[PDB]
Amino acid sequence: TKVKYPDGFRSWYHVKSMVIQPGHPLENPFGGIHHVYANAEAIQGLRGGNYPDGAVLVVDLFDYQEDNHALVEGKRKLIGVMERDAKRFSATGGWGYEGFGEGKPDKRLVTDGGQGCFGCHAAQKESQYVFSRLRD
Amino acid sequence: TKVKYPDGFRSWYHVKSMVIQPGHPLENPFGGIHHVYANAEAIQGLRGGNYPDGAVLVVDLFDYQEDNHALVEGKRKLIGVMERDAKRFSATGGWGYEGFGEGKPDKRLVTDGGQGCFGCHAAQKESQYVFSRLRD
Ligand code: HEC
Ligand code: HEC
Ligand SMILES: [Zn+2]
Ligand SMILES: [Zn+2]
């Protein structure tokens, strides 16, 4: 009942990106440039299907440096991972919630079995707990 | 002698992102959040392998909006496209250069056979006229 580290996530479908700057309510700790990645299974959910067991969403969070009016990606801060399993992750609405510090499998960030993650993602129950929207 | 519209580039490997903000010397026309994509052939060349003919790099440029210390992706402004053909695009260092307004296949932008594009990209002869570097 631990989220598997999503090996190869970096080769998945890039869903969207956002910059969270200092002053954002979520600055600690989602401050930075982030990219959302979906595996094949998660794409079915993003396209308007039911999220199937084995869907994985990853949010990939980088530091950035403001250099002469460019924001330039620096070090990877962490990844967030949502792993679909309606049974095993039933306590958090069928998604397993995990963080990996610097995107390393040995740096698990989640210490409450994902209740805090779920507490915010709950606001999106009607879109199956996923904020990101597919775009061209 | 024309660069093909890179159908499906949104499914390709996401190489990197950067934000160019007001004040940047390249604000016209490179202002916004841009995402770099690489097909399989392009990935070979980015890894320090060589670029096969049919390698395609895309730079996907979005407008952004400020939204309470978040930069949020808005409308697509354009895509830039580099298509590898050592012989056919030999006048511009073996890469064909094209822009598509709003990434629409019908809004081709380049009028000088890509000499303008190649001029800036020539700074990067040492790495085959590619600025982007693979990251983790
Ligand atoms: C609100 C106060 C949040 C808490 C606590 C957590 N997340 Fe979150 N998450 C949030 C938003 C507003 C977004 C969308 C960002 C965007 O670019 O639109 C996200 C996104 C994710 C993603 C990408 C999938 C998606 O739902 O869009 C993942 C994989 C994700 N978040 C995981 C995650 C984990 C593991 C958390 C606990 C450590 C967590 N999030 C907390 C808002 C909030
Ligand atoms: C300098 C003033 C530039 C001119 C004119 C053009 N491009 Fe460019 N390009 C430039 C930089 C500094 C970068 C890297 C951006 C980053 O995030 O690192 C790019 C990138 C591209 C890419 C992605 C591949 C790469 O080399 O990194 C493509 C596909 C690309 N640019 C195409 C392109 C075309 C078609 C142009 C003429 C319309 C063009 N570029 C002009 C700098 C400059
Ligand atoms: Zn403020
Ligand atoms: Zn600035």
Side-chain angles (χ1 to χ4, degrees), chain A residues 1-3 5-27 29-64 66-74 76-86 88-124 126-136, chain B residues 1-3 5-65 67-74 76-86 88-124 127-136:
Chain A
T1 57
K2 299 276 205 194
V3 178
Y5 175 89
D7 286 289
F9 78 86
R10 263 300 269 108
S11 277
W12 296 352
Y13 183 68
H14 177 207
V15 178
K16 67 173 299 186
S17 304
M18 194 183 282
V19 188
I20 296 192
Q21 298 139 309
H24 196 277
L26 298 185
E27 178 192 8
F30 308 117
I33 302 169
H34 76 257
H35 313 296
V36 180
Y37 296 98
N39 68 2
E41 280 83 358
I43 286 167
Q44 302 182 7
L46 285 170
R47 287 190 164 140
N50 287 329
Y51 282 100
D53 297 336
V56 184
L57 292 161
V58 171
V59 59
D60 190 9
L61 176 68
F62 293 75
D63 267 303
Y64 67 88
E66 187 172 5
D67 174 19
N68 191 58
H69 297 309
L71 305 189
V72 171
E73 287 185 309
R76 177 175 282 110
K77 262 170 78 150
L78 55 83
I79 72 185
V81 188
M82 283 167 73
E83 168 182 320
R84 188 67 196 176
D85 197 312
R88 292 181 14 251
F89 298 127
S90 56
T92 50
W95 287 108
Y97 289 97
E98 183 68 275
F100 300 91
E102 305 182 318
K104 286 165 180 154
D106 291 321
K107 312 201 168 203
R108 297 187 169 264
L109 294 180
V110 154
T111 64
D112 66 352
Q115 284 308 315
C117 303
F118 177 58
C120 186
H121 277 262
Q124 294 291 302
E126 299 304 315
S127 46
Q128 299 173 78
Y129 299 105
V130 177
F131 289 95
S132 302
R133 299 292 168 251
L134 265 196
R135 54 160 186 73
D136 226 325
Chain B
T1 56
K2 58 133 64 88
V3 174
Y5 181 83
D7 311 293
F9 76 84
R10 274 302 278 107
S11 65
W12 294 356
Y13 178 76
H14 172 222
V15 174
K16 66 171 308 198
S17 303
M18 185 189 289
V19 193
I20 290 176
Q21 309 187 278
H24 192 283
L26 300 189
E27 227 288 337
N28 316 283
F30 293 144
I33 298 173
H34 75 249
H35 304 298
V36 182
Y37 298 95
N39 71 356
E41 288 81 7
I43 286 163
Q44 177 175 336
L46 285 162
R47 271 183 172 145
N50 277 313
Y51 284 103
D53 287 354
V56 178
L57 297 168
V58 179
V59 61
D60 195 6
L61 175 67
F62 286 80
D63 187 39
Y64 65 83
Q65 307 152 261
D67 181 20
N68 188 23
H69 309 288
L71 309 185
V72 167
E73 298 173 308
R76 179 173 284 105
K77 299 170 50 160
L78 60 86
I79 70 175
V81 184
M82 286 165 69
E83 180 192 302
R84 185 73 201 169
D85 195 315
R88 301 208 301 93
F89 297 121
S90 67
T92 58
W95 288 105
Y97 292 86
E98 179 68 276
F100 299 89
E102 300 186 305
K104 295 172 153 169
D106 286 337
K107 308 199 170 163
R108 301 185 168 256
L109 296 181
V110 164
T111 59
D112 62 356
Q115 289 298 318
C117 307
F118 176 56
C120 186
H121 281 254
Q124 287 289 315
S127 64
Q128 279 87 61
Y129 305 109
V130 180
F131 281 100
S132 298
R133 312 272 164 264
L134 272 155
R135 64 150 169 79
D136 296 342

PDB file of all heavy atoms in Angstrom, chain A residues 22-42, unseen atoms left out:
ATOM      1  N   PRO A  22       7.011  32.944  -5.531  1.00  0.00           N
ATOM      2  CA  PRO A  22       6.859  33.351  -4.138  1.00  0.00           C
ATOM      3  C   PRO A  22       5.624  34.258  -3.982  1.00  0.00           C
ATOM      4  O   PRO A  22       5.367  35.106  -4.841  1.00  0.00           O
ATOM      5  CB  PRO A  22       8.191  34.065  -3.852  1.00  0.00           C
ATOM      6  CG  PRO A  22       9.161  33.393  -4.791  1.00  0.00           C
ATOM      7  CD  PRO A  22       8.353  33.250  -6.063  1.00  0.00           C
ATOM      8  N   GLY A  23       4.892  34.057  -2.889  1.00  0.00           N
ATOM      9  CA  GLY A  23       3.638  34.764  -2.585  1.00  0.00           C
ATOM     10  C   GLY A  23       2.436  33.889  -2.862  1.00  0.00           C
ATOM     11  O   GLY A  23       1.375  34.169  -2.305  1.00  0.00           O
ATOM     12  N   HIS A  24       2.580  32.859  -3.700  1.00  0.00           N
ATOM     13  CA  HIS A  24       1.469  31.909  -3.980  1.00  0.00           C
ATOM     14  C   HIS A  24       1.082  31.234  -2.673  1.00  0.00           C
ATOM     15  O   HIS A  24       1.951  30.896  -1.856  1.00  0.00           O
ATOM     16  CB  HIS A  24       1.807  30.876  -5.064  1.00  0.00           C
ATOM     17  CG  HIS A  24       0.589  30.187  -5.590  1.00  0.00           C
ATOM     18  ND1 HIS A  24       0.016  29.099  -4.945  1.00  0.00           N
ATOM     19  CD2 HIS A  24      -0.201  30.451  -6.651  1.00  0.00           C
ATOM     20  CE1 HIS A  24      -1.063  28.713  -5.605  1.00  0.00           C
ATOM     21  NE2 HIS A  24      -1.213  29.522  -6.661  1.00  0.00           N
ATOM     22  N   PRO A  25      -0.225  31.017  -2.426  1.00  0.00           N
ATOM     23  CA  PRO A  25      -0.641  30.309  -1.211  1.00  0.00           C
ATOM     24  C   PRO A  25       0.024  28.929  -1.082  1.00  0.00           C
ATOM     25  O   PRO A  25       0.159  28.494   0.009  1.00  0.00           O
ATOM     26  CB  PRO A  25      -2.167  30.191  -1.340  1.00  0.00           C
ATOM     27  CG  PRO A  25      -2.552  31.283  -2.337  1.00  0.00           C
ATOM     28  CD  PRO A  25      -1.361  31.427  -3.263  1.00  0.00           C
ATOM     29  N   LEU A  26       0.455  28.297  -2.181  1.00  0.00           N
ATOM     30  CA  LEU A  26       1.001  26.909  -2.137  1.00  0.00           C
ATOM     31  C   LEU A  26       2.523  26.914  -2.275  1.00  0.00           C
ATOM     32  O   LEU A  26       3.095  25.829  -2.486  1.00  0.00           O
ATOM     33  CB  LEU A  26       0.343  26.095  -3.250  1.00  0.00           C
ATOM     34  CG  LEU A  26      -1.172  25.949  -3.134  1.00  0.00           C
ATOM     35  CD1 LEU A  26      -1.691  25.032  -4.224  1.00  0.00           C
ATOM     36  CD2 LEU A  26      -1.577  25.456  -1.754  1.00  0.00           C
ATOM     37  N   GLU A  27       3.146  28.086  -2.129  1.00  0.00           N
ATOM     38  CA  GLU A  27       4.602  28.300  -2.323  1.00  0.00           C
ATOM     39  C   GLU A  27       5.419  27.285  -1.504  1.00  0.00           C
ATOM     40  O   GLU A  27       6.455  26.823  -2.015  1.00  0.00           O
ATOM     41  CB  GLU A  27       4.969  29.722  -1.916  1.00  0.00           C
ATOM     42  CG  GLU A  27       6.451  30.029  -2.042  1.00  0.00           C
ATOM     43  CD  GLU A  27       6.858  31.338  -1.380  1.00  0.00           C
ATOM     44  OE1 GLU A  27       6.011  31.967  -0.666  1.00  0.00           O
ATOM     45  OE2 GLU A  27       8.026  31.732  -1.567  1.00  0.00           O
ATOM     46  N   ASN A  28       5.013  26.989  -0.273  1.00  0.00           N
ATOM     47  CA  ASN A  28       5.644  25.931   0.556  1.00  0.00           C
ATOM     48  C   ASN A  28       4.717  24.733   0.456  1.00  0.00           C
ATOM     49  O   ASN A  28       3.616  24.784   0.959  1.00  0.00           O
ATOM     50  CB  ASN A  28       5.878  26.333   2.020  1.00  0.00           C
ATOM     51  N   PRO A  29       5.104  23.619  -0.185  1.00  0.00           N
ATOM     52  CA  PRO A  29       6.351  23.496  -0.938  1.00  0.00           C
ATOM     53  C   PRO A  29       6.291  23.393  -2.467  1.00  0.00           C
ATOM     54  O   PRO A  29       7.287  22.942  -3.046  1.00  0.00           O
ATOM     55  CB  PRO A  29       6.769  22.099  -0.465  1.00  0.00           C
ATOM     56  CG  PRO A  29       5.449  21.336  -0.363  1.00  0.00           C
ATOM     57  CD  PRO A  29       4.344  22.366  -0.185  1.00  0.00           C
ATOM     58  N   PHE A  30       5.183  23.805  -3.089  1.00  0.00           N
ATOM     59  CA  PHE A  30       4.952  23.612  -4.544  1.00  0.00           C
ATOM     60  C   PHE A  30       5.504  24.808  -5.338  1.00  0.00           C
ATOM     61  O   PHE A  30       5.259  24.862  -6.555  1.00  0.00           O
ATOM     62  CB  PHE A  30       3.475  23.296  -4.796  1.00  0.00           C
ATOM     63  CG  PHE A  30       2.931  22.156  -3.966  1.00  0.00           C
ATOM     64  CD1 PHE A  30       1.915  22.367  -3.046  1.00  0.00           C
ATOM     65  CD2 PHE A  30       3.433  20.872  -4.104  1.00  0.00           C
ATOM     66  CE1 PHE A  30       1.409  21.322  -2.297  1.00  0.00           C
ATOM     67  CE2 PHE A  30       2.938  19.832  -3.341  1.00  0.00           C
ATOM     68  CZ  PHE A  30       1.931  20.064  -2.444  1.00  0.00           C
ATOM     69  N   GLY A  31       6.266  25.702  -4.689  1.00  0.00           N
ATOM     70  CA  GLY A  31       6.989  26.804  -5.351  1.00  0.00           C
ATOM     71  C   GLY A  31       7.929  26.271  -6.421  1.00  0.00           C
ATOM     72  O   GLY A  31       8.637  25.301  -6.132  1.00  0.00           O
ATOM     73  N   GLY A  32       7.936  26.844  -7.628  1.00  0.00           N
ATOM     74  CA  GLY A  32       8.831  26.390  -8.706  1.00  0.00           C
ATOM     75  C   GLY A  32       8.092  26.261 -10.031  1.00  0.00           C
ATOM     76  O   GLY A  32       6.897  26.656 -10.100  1.00  0.00           O
ATOM     77  N   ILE A  33       8.791  25.762 -11.061  1.00  0.00           N
ATOM     78  CA  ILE A  33       8.210  25.357 -12.366  1.00  0.00           C
ATOM     79  C   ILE A  33       7.868  23.874 -12.278  1.00  0.00           C
ATOM     80  O   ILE A  33       8.776  23.086 -11.958  1.00  0.00           O
ATOM     81  CB  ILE A  33       9.171  25.640 -13.525  1.00  0.00           C
ATOM     82  CG1 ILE A  33       9.539  27.119 -13.572  1.00  0.00           C
ATOM     83  CG2 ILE A  33       8.569  25.171 -14.834  1.00  0.00           C
ATOM     84  CD1 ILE A  33      10.669  27.427 -14.500  1.00  0.00           C
ATOM     85  N   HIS A  34       6.615  23.508 -12.574  1.00  0.00           N
ATOM     86  CA  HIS A  34       6.174  22.097 -12.549  1.00  0.00           C
ATOM     87  C   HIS A  34       5.590  21.698 -13.891  1.00  0.00           C
ATOM     88  O   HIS A  34       5.026  22.570 -14.652  1.00  0.00           O
ATOM     89  CB  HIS A  34       5.273  21.770 -11.354  1.00  0.00           C
ATOM     90  CG  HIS A  34       3.868  22.249 -11.459  1.00  0.00           C
ATOM     91  ND1 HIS A  34       3.425  23.370 -10.788  1.00  0.00           N
ATOM     92  CD2 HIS A  34       2.792  21.739 -12.099  1.00  0.00           C
ATOM     93  CE1 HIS A  34       2.138  23.526 -11.023  1.00  0.00           C
ATOM     94  NE2 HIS A  34       1.731  22.547 -11.816  1.00  0.00           N
ATOM     95  N   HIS A  35       5.815  20.421 -14.183  1.00  0.00           N
ATOM     96  CA  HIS A  35       5.311  19.724 -15.381  1.00  0.00           C
ATOM     97  C   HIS A  35       4.481  18.537 -14.902  1.00  0.00           C
ATOM     98  O   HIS A  35       4.924  17.836 -13.968  1.00  0.00           O
ATOM     99  CB  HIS A  35       6.473  19.317 -16.261  1.00  0.00           C
ATOM    100  CG  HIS A  35       7.433  20.412 -16.470  1.00  0.00           C
ATOM    101  ND1 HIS A  35       7.080  21.566 -17.134  1.00  0.00           N
ATOM    102  CD2 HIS A  35       8.720  20.545 -16.097  1.00  0.00           C
ATOM    103  CE1 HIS A  35       8.133  22.355 -17.210  1.00  0.00           C
ATOM    104  NE2 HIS A  35       9.146  21.762 -16.540  1.00  0.00           N
ATOM    105  N   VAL A  36       3.329  18.344 -15.524  1.00  0.00           N
ATOM    106  CA  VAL A  36       2.437  17.190 -15.260  1.00  0.00           C
ATOM    107  C   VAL A  36       2.652  16.188 -16.392  1.00  0.00           C
ATOM    108  O   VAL A  36       2.742  16.596 -17.560  1.00  0.00           O
ATOM    109  CB  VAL A  36       0.973  17.631 -15.098  1.00  0.00           C
ATOM    110  CG1 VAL A  36       0.062  16.442 -14.825  1.00  0.00           C
ATOM    111  CG2 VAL A  36       0.833  18.686 -13.996  1.00  0.00           C
ATOM    112  N   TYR A  37       2.805  14.932 -16.011  1.00  0.00           N
ATOM    113  CA  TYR A  37       3.030  13.766 -16.888  1.00  0.00           C
ATOM    114  C   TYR A  37       1.943  12.760 -16.559  1.00  0.00           C
ATOM    115  O   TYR A  37       1.525  12.636 -15.368  1.00  0.00           O
ATOM    116  CB  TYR A  37       4.415  13.168 -16.686  1.00  0.00           C
ATOM    117  CG  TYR A  37       5.527  14.100 -17.054  1.00  0.00           C
ATOM    118  CD1 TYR A  37       6.185  14.836 -16.099  1.00  0.00           C
ATOM    119  CD2 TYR A  37       5.888  14.287 -18.377  1.00  0.00           C
ATOM    120  CE1 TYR A  37       7.220  15.697 -16.426  1.00  0.00           C
ATOM    121  CE2 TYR A  37       6.917  15.139 -18.719  1.00  0.00           C
ATOM    122  CZ  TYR A  37       7.566  15.872 -17.748  1.00  0.00           C
ATOM    123  OH  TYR A  37       8.576  16.725 -18.085  1.00  0.00           O
ATOM    124  N   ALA A  38       1.425  12.127 -17.601  1.00  0.00           N
ATOM    125  CA  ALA A  38       0.398  11.069 -17.468  1.00  0.00           C
ATOM    126  C   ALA A  38       0.904   9.834 -18.202  1.00  0.00           C
ATOM    127  O   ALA A  38       1.500  10.010 -19.282  1.00  0.00           O
ATOM    128  CB  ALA A  38      -0.907  11.545 -18.036  1.00  0.00           C
ATOM    129  N   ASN A  39       0.722   8.648 -17.625  1.00  0.00           N
ATOM    130  CA  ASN A  39       0.968   7.372 -18.356  1.00  0.00           C
ATOM    131  C   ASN A  39      -0.254   7.101 -19.238  1.00  0.00           C
ATOM    132  O   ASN A  39      -1.248   7.883 -19.160  1.00  0.00           O
ATOM    133  CB  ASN A  39       1.342   6.204 -17.429  1.00  0.00           C
ATOM    134  CG  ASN A  39       0.225   5.730 -16.531  1.00  0.00           C
ATOM    135  OD1 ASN A  39      -0.901   6.221 -16.581  1.00  0.00           O
ATOM    136  ND2 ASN A  39       0.530   4.751 -15.696  1.00  0.00           N
ATOM    137  N   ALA A  40      -0.159   6.072 -20.075  1.00  0.00           N
ATOM    138  CA  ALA A  40      -1.186   5.701 -21.087  1.00  0.00           C
ATOM    139  C   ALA A  40      -2.527   5.616 -20.385  1.00  0.00           C
ATOM    140  O   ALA A  40      -3.513   6.233 -20.838  1.00  0.00           O
ATOM    141  CB  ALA A  40      -0.824   4.385 -21.742  1.00  0.00           C
ATOM    142  N   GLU A  41      -2.550   4.934 -19.250  1.00  0.00           N
ATOM    143  CA  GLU A  41      -3.780   4.686 -18.455  1.00  0.00           C
ATOM    144  C   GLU A  41      -4.382   6.001 -17.968  1.00  0.00           C
ATOM    145  O   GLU A  41      -5.624   6.131 -17.937  1.00  0.00           O
ATOM    146  CB  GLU A  41      -3.443   3.849 -17.227  1.00  0.00           C
ATOM    147  CG  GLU A  41      -3.303   2.383 -17.530  1.00  0.00           C
ATOM    148  CD  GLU A  41      -1.950   1.959 -18.069  1.00  0.00           C
ATOM    149  OE1 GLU A  41      -1.023   2.820 -18.276  1.00  0.00           O
ATOM    150  OE2 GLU A  41      -1.834   0.748 -18.264  1.00  0.00           O
ATOM    151  N   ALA A  42      -3.526   6.926 -17.521  1.00  0.00           N
ATOM    152  CA  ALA A  42      -4.026   8.200 -16.955  1.00  0.00           C
ATOM    153  C   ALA A  42      -4.625   9.034 -18.104  1.00  0.00           C
ATOM    154  O   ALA A  42      -5.641   9.673 -17.864  1.00  0.00           O
ATOM    155  CB  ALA A  42      -2.924   8.909 -16.189  1.00  0.00           C
TER     156      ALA A  42
END
